[PDB]
Amino acid sequence: HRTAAHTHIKGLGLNSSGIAEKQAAGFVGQCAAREACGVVVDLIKAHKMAGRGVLLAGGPGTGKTALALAISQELGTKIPFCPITGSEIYSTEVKKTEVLMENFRRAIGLRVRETKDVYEGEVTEMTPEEAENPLGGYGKTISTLLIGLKSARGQKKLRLDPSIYEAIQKERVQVGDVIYIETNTGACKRVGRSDAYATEFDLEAEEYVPIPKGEVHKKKEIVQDVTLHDLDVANARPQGGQDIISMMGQLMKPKMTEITDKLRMEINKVVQKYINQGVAELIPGVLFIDEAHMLDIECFTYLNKALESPIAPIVVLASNRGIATIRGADDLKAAHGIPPDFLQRLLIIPTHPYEPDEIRRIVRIRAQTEGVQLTDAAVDRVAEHGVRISLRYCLQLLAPASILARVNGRTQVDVQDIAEAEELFLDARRSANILTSTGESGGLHGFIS
Amino acid sequence: ISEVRGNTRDHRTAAHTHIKGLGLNSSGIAEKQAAGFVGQCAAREACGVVVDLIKAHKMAGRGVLLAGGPGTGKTALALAISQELGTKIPFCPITGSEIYSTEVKKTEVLMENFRRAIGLRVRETKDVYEGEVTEMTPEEAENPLGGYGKTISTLLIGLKSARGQKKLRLDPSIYEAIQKERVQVGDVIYIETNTGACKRVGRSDAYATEFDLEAEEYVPIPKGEVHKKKEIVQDVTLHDLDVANARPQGGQDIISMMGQLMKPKMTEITDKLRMEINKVVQKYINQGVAELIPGVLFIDEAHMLDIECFTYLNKALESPIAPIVVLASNRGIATIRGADDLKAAHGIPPDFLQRLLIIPTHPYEPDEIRRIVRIRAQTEGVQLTDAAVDRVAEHGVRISLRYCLQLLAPASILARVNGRTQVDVQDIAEAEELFLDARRSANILTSTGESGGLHGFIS
Amino acid sequence: LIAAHSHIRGLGVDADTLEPRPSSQGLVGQEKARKAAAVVLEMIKQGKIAGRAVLIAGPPSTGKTAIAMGMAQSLGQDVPFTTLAASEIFSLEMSKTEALTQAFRKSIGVRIKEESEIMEGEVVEIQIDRSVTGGAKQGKLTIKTTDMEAIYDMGSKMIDAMTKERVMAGDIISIDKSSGKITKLGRSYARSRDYDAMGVDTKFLQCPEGELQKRKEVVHTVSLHEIDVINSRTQGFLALFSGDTGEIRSEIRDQINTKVAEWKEEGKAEIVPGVLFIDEVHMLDIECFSYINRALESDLAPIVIMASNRGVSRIRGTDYKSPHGLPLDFLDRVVIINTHPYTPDELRQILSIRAQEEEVDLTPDALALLTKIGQEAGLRYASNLITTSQLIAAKRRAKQVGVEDVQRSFKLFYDPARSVRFVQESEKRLIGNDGVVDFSY
Amino acid sequence: ELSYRQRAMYQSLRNQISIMDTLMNLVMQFRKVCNHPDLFERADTSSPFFCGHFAETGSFLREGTNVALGYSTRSLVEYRLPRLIWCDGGRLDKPGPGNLVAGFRSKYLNHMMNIWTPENIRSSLEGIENFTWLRFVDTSLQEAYRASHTDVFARAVDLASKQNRLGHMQIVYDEPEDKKWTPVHALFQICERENPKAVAEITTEGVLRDLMNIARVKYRELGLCRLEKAARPRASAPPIEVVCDSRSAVIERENIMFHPAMRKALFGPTPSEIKEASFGPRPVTLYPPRALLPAPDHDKQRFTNITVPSMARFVTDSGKLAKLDELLRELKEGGHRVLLYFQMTRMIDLMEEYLTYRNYKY
Amino acid sequence: KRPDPMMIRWVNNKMGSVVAVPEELLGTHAGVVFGAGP
Ligand SMILES: Nc1ncnc2c1ncn2[C@@H]1O[C@H](COP(=O)(O)OP(=O)(O)O)[C@@H](O)[C@H]1O
Ligand SMILES: Nc1ncnc2c1ncn2[C@@H]1O[C@H](COP(=O)(O)OP(=O)(O)O)[C@@H](O)[C@H]1O
Ligand SMILES: Nc1ncnc2c1ncn2[C@@H]1O[C@H](COP(=O)(O)OP(=O)(O)O)[C@@H](O)[C@H]1O
């Protein structure tokens, strides 16, 4: 609903033959790059390949990120699209290669069938039974609970393990409550009071809920979407048991941990069981590393091994930089800011500047996307920028010009409202002239160097 | 128990013990020497206006710079400002070096000290009954509840203090507190009227002889009235409100209690918390139940702050609740700690310097140094011949004020060791030979460390 | 108290035409910049467009912060306005990227509505039953209006509140049934005399009228950051305030973004996007700029406003300079506002407002001299001399600040340029950049 | 229009128009989801994916009316260790045959040559010796010894028993005559004897009391304790376990992972202990003596990630039902009881559930 | 209905308040405060 830099992008706008329509799905031009991005979408949808690298190469403002977000829409919601900047990699909690691995496994999805095996009923009896321990000093301990559950199809009496009674107790269950018990986890939920004895005069603000219809014991099945990283985090910070470690692990502050290769390898074995059991579909996705020049030579040297993994997502890099110094490696310059070792691994999709008529087309697509009804002379004015100034400066003027026009009572933006927008809101280059002319000498009114 | 010592309550003397104030007329003009100062009449008069700026509650977020060479009395002036304000107004001194914590970001460390320099004065009434329990006695009710057989309409408690005792009629619900707290006759308790509950201090030491062994210490009978109703005035800083909200102290759960058993690590207190604290504070100020009492954050060697500290201080000083900041600096024109391409005066960024009222501190004349030697000697308790005074003052001209003040104690030792109740030239001429200044020692270095060598200094 | 910007009470523009008045709402001059900020301010209020970065640029002073503070006043309390100093981002508890993510998400409000239900009545009786040696508690509240009496059962949480509040018969109380909070409004009976230590007798009140229960629609605004913190945790929601929150995982934010959209479609919530103002933005690193530039591109990005004093200046964390000290591919995404140094009549009008805000009665010649000082020493220094001259005038019991007081203040307190000369005139006695100094006379 | 729940499922199933033909079968389920999505998939109480093993019930008919619910939950990640490592002395701290070091080392390092043992402390209790201060810290040699050997959890349980008596002294020993009295064996607990926190709780104008509770109050006043959860973990698992083919491992698993003393401390006194303590002739101090498990910060979600579907969610999950809700309230104020006709019979059941929620009448 | 053996009951109204004690707690330590210990 809110309008942002890419709201006009809907897809790659390809034909069924995989040729790009010169203006489609919000794009103008980049056709060869949109066609290359189509073949990458085909590489992703065909699950067979792991750890292929793509680099979107091209100057700033050439639509590299629009291409990546268009890929994210051609893949649709089912496939994991995992966007990060290279500046997100420097965590204070864990080594930066941990964050890369977390993002690699976040980009691999799993859809898995799960059977939840549960008891539901109104608690009609609850009777604890206990033992006098030998002198351990903590005193007597509850040995078991007997609990009666009533549903619509009769009732059942449960002799609970005291580990499950601790779930019942920390859930503050009472006689006459309706509860859900999940035998998968031993976990408990108090659903409410019964709608029986649902008198109004409680300060407790109870939710009275109807007696569970059906059998008191149920075995529902549901389909869960999870990533491999979701499993890593679940097994590294255990929280689903009723044991003391799981219990205290919900009271401690959450913190990221450098999950070992040993854990990740053994979760591959677990997930492959789900595949062989036929309860899971593996759905590998894509990791978009934007601003990949902000990675460093340790990140890039780790990515070598990470991409060689027998399962890894597709990685799409984007970079906007020429021959530049590699970060963390001030001795080494290379094109794109990517090490010459790593660049050999990628397929480079070069991305090119727009022509003036393409800028005019983009300005009109962008204007109507924002709902800026804009006259043709006003379109031509805005498209003189983008040629003489960055393309982004065109698109950013459309909103001020709309405000100024409507403040002038106009229904639509004239050349006048842009010419005022051009004056209130400078480009970087005109501001850079103001600096060099005003800061031409120091003083009270000078700019600070 | 403890064996009290009857000896005289004297005091240690430090480098600033002679300073007692700014030494100003009621017209604010500096007296040429007064309150331990000699000279600096301009800087003392300027600090006197700063003192009146602080005592007037219009000030928020003003900045001061004390600018001048080493030895020029900038720290003396800051301490004199603090003494002119007294104890009722916060003075929070730090160096710029203290901001480089390992445990939170340095903008948090600075904002803590920034809020330490802001006080709050809250007036409330304490209202309690207290004493040794002389009695506990139920009053049986007129209309007992069916099926219970016991029904009490009042519990009566006798409380004795040193200053009297009272028969106290209490709502029977206090049974809950007494039974949990295990109050007994001869225990010292108080009743607080905002709850009607009671708390036990201990057993009265009138009963310390009840047994050959009992496993509690006894406590004295309360020496006040049996009933206290007092206004109480609480010194609070806003930083105290930060910590008290951001880490509650009294929590009775395992994670709270494990928390209070482990080091109380600082945390990066949110601006959302601080901004809500301010709003509730301003509410209670508008109710008139509290005074705000903004004080002084004094940062010495402020040239040790870096450009990240200074840029945060811009935002901090713009806060509507803020202390005054007084900076001191001696760094000439020098490189900004965090902006190695940028040099500026005082080592303060030109952006920030424009905010400060600069106060310059100048050097001292030979006759002022001599007067300082006189003031220092009588403060250390040393007494000098005039020729010893003049010899010390001559080193003050040729070397440094600080060095000469540091000769007084060594020479006093040597005088009394030689049996003399006053120091003379023969002792000064000896103190100055045992204890070199930096220059004479630097000459020894310059001669001896001309090269590597078996007996060479290490360069 | 009176702070550096306490006189700024708005942007000072005609709400219809966005024409800046030459002086109103405490702002003076900067008309081109104030109109530009007024267009930004309107596209903030409209909410429609996300992720606009506007840089306010100018020399020191010239009101760039004052303009940003005028915008904040004109939005009022409801729209979020997250002030951030760029030096806050260098946390030890979280990365710069996470610190920026939190600062963005602090600037988007979620405005959530609920129907509470409340009670208002006289307590006729209380019964509480307590298990000896603790554990369970039970009770009944009998509560009354002029028109109803009813008996409500009480749970332990309510009995704790009742006893903490020391509720008694004859109290007038209100209970928010949804939150469970209790407040005593007053008493209808006298305070009794049979017992001691009953404490303060609160306000007398007539008994409440009408029904006991009343529904009450209430609205609460919470940040996306506050939703993040409590949904990344089971326990420890004080991290909203203590700042103990770590680097929150992106799975939690992705879920919250999806749910807040759903809450908007459900009509449960309104999203109210506000402003992140990054002052001193030149203090960020290249790594921070290469995060903001793509953080802006999201549908939930706030409007970002920045201020810089810097010329063509070195970018932090790299070897090279750029305009404003900001990377060019960052400035590509920015529309820039330029503020201009004030004229003497603008200086005079500002100093008159500062004088009026501080309640200082300048003589006309003192205002003229402060204006002359303002031209040569600067607006901040000339402002500092106003409060200083008021104090000096109070020493001589003067009813107005005379020229003598401004001259006396000018004498006692140096301006920056004079202090720079003082430093240059004492290069031997101040510590140099070489660390050398001479202590002798 | 369609609610987002309808819109998502409808779009996914109408996408099959591109795949197949079956059109009648598809357009039938168009009409289904466009009436209410709970006709197509019922919203029901749900929880994260469980990445763990559990014992399935194989039959309901054979189960009967009385059944024992064991805690079956185990990790699928499963660390096989030989008993030579896990039981027969590859754990250096576990004494036995083979591990001949551990028995000596435990006695000598924890007791004989341990500085906190009372006999060692007592030799160091005067003058400049390293325990000189222990006279003025309120601990005994026994408490110091305990606090140096028990872990932070056990020490925190011991704190639960204690009375903050130095805070009460601050209320009583106020006056110049009281000399701010402090028991000399607590002399060094300065910050406990002088602390505004105690005074702020006794003054009747709660001004500083409220100023110290600002954060907890506004957190609660914002409703963050009651607002629905916007996220939860997508997967959940129990702890990884050692698997060792020995009985000692099974005992030691129960001793650690289901630690009785920690659990008893968290969950408090057992009901018979409460009975014994309340009916006894003389008072007795229970263990621990209370439940030391904290209150959950989320007053409704508590300690589990299980969600229950709201009826308000059910109402808004159908665009027709959401639109009809306004029309039915208008029709109620127009004087009409509910009367509607449906092409799908199961929709009548959902409307009966809707009406029994709303308590409007047919 | 005969009252619970261990819930002590406080009730407050216009007449002030009372505490009533179960017959089972008289002769226990909880009776000592009420004059009805062992
Ligand atoms: N071919 C195109 N068609 C339509 N819009 C485009 C095209 N290329 C770029 N844009 C738009 O121009 C703006 C800048 O493009 P962007 O992807 O940010 O460039 P880069 O990521 O390389 O800096 C965005 O609003 C983007 O949606
Ligand atoms: N005007 C003065 N009158 C009296 N004593 C002074 C004066 N100025 C400095 N001193 C004393 O001489 C020493 C040098 O002053 P100090 O404030 O330490 O210098 P700086 O500000 O450079 O650190 C201190 O012991 C100080 O107390
Ligand atoms: N146009 C103006 N109207 C009123 N006060 C102003 C104006 N410009 C600056 N000021 C005041 O002068 C001081 C300096 O302006 P400020 O906004 O801090 O400049 P900077 O851009 O350096 O932050 C502040 O106290 C500010 O309130």
The experimental method, as deposited, was: cryo-EM
Two tokens at A390? Answer: 């960055």
| CATH number reported for the structural domain that contains residue C394 in this entry | 1.10.8.60
Q: How near does any CA of chain A get to the CA of D202, in Å?
A: 29
Please indicate whether, in this complex, the C-beta atoms of C132 and E25 are within 8 angstroms of each other: yes
H or E element at residue B458: none
Asked whether the beta carbons of A312 and A104 are under 8 A apart, the reply is yes
* Residue corresponding to tokens 């009665």: C361
Measured between beta carbons, the chain D residues lying within 8 angstroms of E25 are: 278-279
Q: Distance between CA atoms of A23 and A9, rounded to whole angstroms?
A: 11
d(CA C91, CA B363): 42
Whose structure tokens read 């509470």? Answer: C116
Of D152, D184, D211, D263, which to mutate for an interface test with B (greatest number of B Cβ within 10 Å)? D211
What's the gap in Å between A431 CA and the centre of ligand 3? Answer: 21
Long-range Cβ pairs for the range A178-181 (8 Å, 24+): A178/A120, A178/A121, A178/A122, A178/A123, A178/A209, A178/A211, A178/A212, A179/A120, A179/A121, A179/A123, A179/A149, A180/A118, A180/A119, A180/A120, A180/D45, A180/D306, A180/D308, A181/A118, A181/A119, A181/A120, A181/D69
**The Cα angle at residue B251 between residues C165 and D150, in degrees rounded to 5:** 150
Burial call B393-428: b when 16+ CB within 10 Å, e when fewer: bebbbebbbebbbebbbbbbebbeeeeeeebbbebb
Check D230 against C227: CB less than 8 A apart. Answer: yes
* Integer Cα distance of B94 and B113 in angstroms: 8
C32 alpha-carbon distance from chain centroid: 26
Give the ligand whose atoms come closest to the C-alpha of residue C306. 3
* B369 CB near ligand 2 (under 6 Å): no
Q: Which residues contact B86 (CB under 8 A, 6 or more apart)?
A: none
SS (H, E, C) chain A: CCECCCCCCCCCCECCCCCECCEECCEECCHHHHHHHHHHHHHHHCCCCCCCEEEEECCCCCCHHHHHHHHHHHCCCCCCEEEEEHHHHCCCCCCHHHHHHHHHHHCEEEEEEEEEEEEEEEEEEEEEEEECCCCCCCCCEEEEEEEEEEECCEEEEEEECHHHHHHHHHCCCCCCEEEEEECCCCEEEEEEEECCCCCCCECCCCCEECCCCCCCEEEEEEEEEEEHHHHHHHHHCCCCCCCHHHHHHHHCCCCCCCCCHHHHHHHHHHHHHHHHCCCEEEEECEEEEECHHHCCHHHHHHHHHHHCCCCCCEEEEEECCCEEEECCEEEEEEECCCCHHHHCCEEEEECCCCCHHHHHHHHHHHHHHCCCCECHHHHHHHCCCCCCCCHHHHHHHHHHHHHHHHHCCCCCECHHHHHHHHHHCECHHHHHHHHHHHCCCCCCCCCEC
| Annotated binding-site ranges of B for ATP | 15-16, 38, 71-76, 364, 376, 402
Instruction: Out of A37, A65, A316, give the residue to mutate to test ligand 1, the one with the largest number of ligand atoms within 8 Å of its CB.
Output: A65
Q: How far apart are CA C295 and CA C293, in angstroms?
A: 6
Say yes or no: C118 contacts chain A, CB-CB below 8 A.
no
Q: How far is CA D55 from CA A145, D58, D72, D80, in A?
A: 20, 9, 6, 21
Distance (Å) from CA B74 to ligand 2 centroid: 7
Q: Which two tokens stand for residue B390?
A: 């003049």
- E29 and D275: CB-CB below 8 Å? no
* Burial degree of C100 (CB within 10 A; 0-12, 13-18, 19+): buried
Strand partners, A131: A141
- Which tokens go with D124? 């160091």
Distance from CA of E7 to the nearest CA of B (A): 11
- The dihedral through the CA atoms of D17, D19, D23, D28 has a sign that is negative
Chains B, D: CB contacts within 8 A come to: 145
Helix, coil or strand: residue B209? coil
CA D164 and chain centroid, separation? 27
* Degrees, nearest 5: CA angle A196-A201-A206: 60
* End-to-end Cα spacing for chain D: 26
Structure tokens at B267: 């945390």
Region of A247 on the Ramachandran plot (φ > 0 left; ψ -120 to 50 alpha; else beta):
alpha
Q: CA nearest C59 in B: which residue?
A: B351
Place of tokens 């990221």: A256
Nearest CA to CA, how far is B177 from chain E (Å)?
Answer: 11
State which of C2, C5, C31, C283 you would mutate to test the pocket of ligand 3, scoring each by most atoms of that ligand within 8 A of its C-beta.
C5
Which B positions 376-395 lie with beta carbon below 8 A of chain D?
none
Helices (H), E1-38: none
Q: Which ligand is nearest to the CA of B35?
A: 2
For chain C, how many residues are written?
441
Reading the block at residue B212, the tokens are 């050959």
Burial-class residue D9 by CB neighbours within 10 Å (0-12, 13-18, 19+): middle
Token digits for B315?
């935002």
What's the rounded Cα separation, in Å, for the pair B396 and C196? 73
d(CA B214, CA B219): 14
Which residues of chain E have a CB within 8 Å of the CB of D278?
A: 6, 25, 28, 30
- Residue A60 to residues A57, A319, A372, D354: CA-CA distances in angstroms? 10, 8, 25, 55
Domain CATH for A214? 2.40.50.360
- Domain of A386: which CATH number? 1.10.8.60
- Evaluate whether B68 touches B74 at the Cβ level (below 8 Å): yes
Cβ-nearest to D236 among A130, A185, A251: A185
Range of the domain at B386: 366-447
Q: What is the resolution of this structure in A?
A: 2.9
Subunit contact C125:E12, Cβ cutoff 8 A: yes
Inter-residue contact C251 to C132 (CB < 8 Å): no
d(CA B444, CA B432): 15
Residues B194 and D202 sit within 8 Å (Cβ to Cβ): yes
Could B125 and D205 be called an inter-chain contact, meaning their C-beta atoms sit closer than 8 Å? yes
> Which among D172, D175, D185, D278 is the top mutation candidate for probing chain B, defined by the most B β-carbons within 10 Å of its own β-carbon?
D172
Please give the DSSP secondary-structure letter assigned to residue B174.
G
